[PDB]
């Protein structure tokens with residue numbers, strides 16, 4: 001049995017990622033693959049216990065699934081994902097954080113402007129922004145179902161109800177200078193984005209869900225300082241073993 005040889009990003013794609021701080025690959029996973037992930041996400045929402053976040057009734061998100069789900073444990077090692085994480089971070093990598101964020105049809109909340117790295121640095125002791133997130137689109141992402149919205153190039157400045165949100169004046173500057181972009185894509189796409197890129201999102205006013213599986217890969221060299229960590233393993237990983245790619249086996 002055979003896995004397709006590892007695909008990596010072209011130089012132009014890498015350049016775009018580094019310039020903009022995000023990049024979309026369309027149609028990485030097929031419909032049947034996404035349905036397997038959707039079904040597993042539903043199980044995690046149902047069984048996640050303390051790892052679930054709710055609509056202040058409906059479970060809206062869950063954390064740390066790769067530690068508890070064999071499917072999600074395999075996903076983070078996928079030959080569709082791991083080679084690109086290694087390429088972009090120029091290192092062996094591990095998963096710092098894993099979350100699934102559902103924005104159901106005609107529902108969802110405003111995510112205030114933030115940089116993920118600010119949290120990871122201060123809360124988890126991540127020493128540098130040598131990390132990224134891969135957002136797998138469980139559903140088509142459109143203008144109208146609450147897409148992640150970015151300041152392109154806004155990661156280049158460095159580190160600027162969320163604990164760490166960005167104020168009106170600091171954001172005004174960024175946006176006046178750099179603008180705003182909400183990357184779109186079909187179901188099965190992957191949105192790669194930098195640990196330090198400012199992003200936000202709005203409620204879903206479509207009749208369609210916007211499920212995202214967000215895998216945060218960190219450089220092994222850039223492992224967090226667990227002496228200054230404040231969070232459980234399912235929010236901030238402590239096992240820095242380098243990930244290896246899934247091979248094709250008979251089971």
Ligand SMILES: O=C(O)CCC(=O)C(=O)O
Pocket residue numbers: 099101111116146147148199200201212
């Ligand atoms: O799901 C979203 O719209 C925002 C997710 C996010 O930025 C985050 O969890 O840090």
Ligand SMILES: [Fe+3]
Pocket residue numbers: 114115116199
């Ligand atoms: Fe975020």
